[PDB]
Amino acid sequence: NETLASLKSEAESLKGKLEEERAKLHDVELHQVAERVEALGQFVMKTRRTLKGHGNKVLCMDWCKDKRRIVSSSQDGKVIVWDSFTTNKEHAVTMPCTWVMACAYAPSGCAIACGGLDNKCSVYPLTFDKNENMAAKKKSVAMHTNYLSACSFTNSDMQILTASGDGTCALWDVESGQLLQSFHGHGADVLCLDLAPSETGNTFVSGGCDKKAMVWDMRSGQCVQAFETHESDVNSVRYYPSGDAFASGSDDATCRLYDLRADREVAIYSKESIIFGASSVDFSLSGRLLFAGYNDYTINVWDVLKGSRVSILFGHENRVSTLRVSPDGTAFCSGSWDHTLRVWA
Amino acid sequence: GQQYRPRMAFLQKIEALVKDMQNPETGVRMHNQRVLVTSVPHAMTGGDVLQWITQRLWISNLEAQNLGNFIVKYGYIYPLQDPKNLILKPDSSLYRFQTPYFWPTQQWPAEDTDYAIYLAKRNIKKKGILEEYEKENYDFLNKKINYKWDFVIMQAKEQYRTGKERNKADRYALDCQEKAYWLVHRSPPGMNNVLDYGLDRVTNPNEVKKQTVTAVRKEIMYYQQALMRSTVKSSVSLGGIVKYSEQFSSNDAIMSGCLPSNPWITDDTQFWDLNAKLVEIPTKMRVERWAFNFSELIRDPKGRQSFQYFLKKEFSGENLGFWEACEDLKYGDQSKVKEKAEEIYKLFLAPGARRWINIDGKTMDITVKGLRHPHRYVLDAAQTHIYMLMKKDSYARYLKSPIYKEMLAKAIEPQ
């Protein structure tokens, strides 16, 4: 096929031209720019709370914007809302399917979204009803052709972003269940997503089993920026708090930082002793620290700017599957295949 | 559903480490073998493997112990005594390297036919020298692969026959080696299945997929689009990142602590009480944070309320109302959008509007042309125009105003 051969030659030509156009402005490395940032104090974080109640692997968690409530979901189909400060369970629902791989808290704090092997994402309201029946109030919003891997509310309770093993992400209207926009481009299962905290608020990033992280324009459905430097599946993605960079965690045992304004990978956080996959990443409030959970049951904490490991945290008795820093930056929560979550500070 | 095993990048990495350990000049210290055993490598102690890891990777004994444990759990190294205990003991306990034939693989799990052969063979070497769980497994397989059973038995008898040409020491050693494999791949109940990788994938990671024309065309489109986009020097963007983290450092409670204390550490909730979303009087830290950038002010409801008071005083108290209306249009209920878009235009933008605000000629034209076919992003240009105007003009003047200064002055200082 001559047309195919010529197109591939043109695509490689443009790839190299783009590489060279970007390289012209790559005048410094992050470790050089950060040469004189102040050193960190002693690392002293420990487990403050252990949330016990799930009957099988914890797969996902999300903090409420109230800074203390947490939603978490399990392989056995159960979703729990905790007041993590007291450890009290406030809400509980069993989904009609197993492997609830995704859950999100609504910004109002009055709803949660979740799904997984059901190929859907559903919204449940949270109420102060005495004998609360959550299952009776399930609203199916998203429909994919394969499993849901990730979800998030946008900047309201009325819209939801999903990622799927079907290779797509999608934006949905909660009230109608209408597909607002599909995002096609990943070569394979999409595993994670995060909404950009930018002033514009028109983009999000996703990661998948094509080993790529892709930044999407929600208005057009187009991928505007793609990054392909990981050597295996991209399990987690997270914007740096200013919105001008994001981090990823991968099966390849590295976490990486990408500079969106210069359009370049700028840091690789890795050690020879760290050979198992990173499942989950999140930033401290200032973006100075990156917390990551790993398949070898540990958490590694990285100095984003200096590139060195700050600490390794032991405690979980199976994979760390999910990790979020709290909304006010005072703590972080890890969830694990050991059936538990921990809050650290 | 899902058909394919996921990528397992860790395997090659363990294998590289194991190869390093077996190096003749720099590998793990090995032991003599006064009894002649030809079928397996020489033994080594758990302590020596651990010391090698600690030294090679330059890490704490805790981290080396964790890693060493996984090398054993995955079956690359196995114990000669207490075999059910898949840890690397930091002592004189003996271990051997597993043969590569019995390493785990990304694409191929251990197969039921092979397990049946192993159990049928073991069954012959005793009557039921089989452990409880193994008897259950054997009975399960006798039913499940009933059709292969003549083959299973033939192969078991064949291997048993061949096993008898080894002397006592080799036979014992080979039996230990094979048992160590099956302990990992068909674990006793109540033992961790380290091989559990979660869900399978829809897409096969081992598929070398032929790119279609449509695929390459789409790749071309990405590059052409990307080449149209502007970037900045790394010194500029990275300088910004470093400065941002520096600016927010004192607000990062994990790094810097907080006042009066961290509720997670002391169980005192005052820090949360003082920083309630709609607290009457904000803390000084909070008011100071509004000065870091315009988004900090806008995203804080107390900050936005203060900023709105400033704007109303300057007769600009509809800009924020318009910005909020556009935010709701874009992110709210979509059954409404067409009507909502038209009503926002009529209320804020049209000549004689009852909440009139000014936008420049170009922005108005973009808006009016878009409104010929209303959609949820139809007011995006007007919204951005008004947001940037507030950011560029009003924000800095707000920070210089008596309104902000009085806010700073009355703000709570805890501790």
Swiss-Prot record, chain A:
Isoform 1 is only detected in retina. Isoform 2 is detected in brain (at protein level). Isoform 2 is detected in brain. It is found in: Membrane. PROSITE patterns: WD_REPEATS_1, WD_REPEATS_2, WD_REPEATS_REGION. Pfam families: WD40_Gbeta (PF25391). WD repeats lie at residues 53-92, 95-134, 143-184, 186-228, 229-268, 270-312, 315-344. InterPro entries: G-protein_beta_WD-40_rep, Gprotein_B, Guanine_nucleotide-bd_bsu, WD40/YVTN_repeat-like_dom_sf, WD40_repeat_CS, WD40_repeat_dom_sf, WD40_rpt. It comes from the Eukaryota. GO terms for cellular component: cell tip; cytosol; dendrite; myelin sheath; nucleus; parallel fiber to Purkinje cell synapse; photoreceptor inner segment; plasma membrane. One of its GO terms (molecular function) is GTPase activator activity. Keywords: Membrane, Repeat, Transducer, WD repeat. PANTHER family: GUANINE NUCLEOTIDE-BINDING PROTEIN BETA G PROTEIN BETA (PTHR19850). Component of a complex composed of RGS9 (isoform RGS9-1), GNB5 and RGS9BP; within this complex, the presence of GNB5 stabilizes both itself and RGS9 and increases RGS9 GTPase-activating protein (GAP) activity. Interacts with RGS7, forming the RGS7-GNB5 complex; within this complex, the presence of GNB5 increases RGS7 GTPase-activating protein (GAP) activity. Interacts with GPR158; promotes the GTPase activator activity of the RGS7-GNB5 complex in absence of glycine, in contrast GTPase activator activity of the RGS7-GNB5 complex is inhibited in presence of glycine. Interacts with RGS6. Enhances GTPase-activating protein (GAP) activity of regulator of G protein signaling (RGS) proteins, such as RGS7 and RGS9, hence involved in the termination of the signaling initiated by the G protein coupled receptors (GPCRs) by accelerating the GTP hydrolysis on the G-alpha subunits, thereby promoting their inactivation. Increases RGS7 GTPase-activating protein (GAP) activity, thereby regulating mood and cognition. Increases RGS9 GTPase-activating protein (GAP) activity, hence contributes to the deactivation of G protein signaling initiated by D(2) dopamine receptors. Belongs to the WD repeat G protein beta family. This is Guanine nucleotide-binding protein subunit beta-5.
UniProtKB/Swiss-Prot annotation, chain B:
Residues 216-277 form the G protein gamma domain. Heterodimer with GNB5. Interacts with RGS7BP, leading to regulate the subcellular location of the heterodimer formed with GNB5. Component of the RGS9-1-Gbeta5 complex composed of RGS9 (RGS9-1), Gbeta5 (GNB5) and RGS9BP. Interacts with PDE6G and GNAT1. Retinal isoform 1 is light-dependent phosphorylated at 'Ser-475'. Phosphorylation is decreased by light exposition. Interaction with RGS9BP is decreased when isoform 1 is phosphorylated at 'Ser-475'. Inhibits signal transduction by increasing the GTPase activity of G protein alpha subunits thereby driving them into their inactive GDP-bound form. Binds to GNAT1. Involved in phototransduction; key element in the recovery phase of visual transduction. It comes from the Eukaryota. Residues 24-99 form the DEP domain. Keywords: Membrane, Phosphoprotein, Sensory transduction, Signal transduction inhibitor, Vision. The keyword Phosphoprotein applies. One of its GO terms (biological process) is response to amphetamine. This is Regulator of G-protein signaling 9. GO terms for cellular component: glutamatergic synapse; photoreceptor inner segment; postsynaptic density membrane; presynaptic membrane; rod photoreceptor outer segment. Residues 293-408 form the RGS domain.
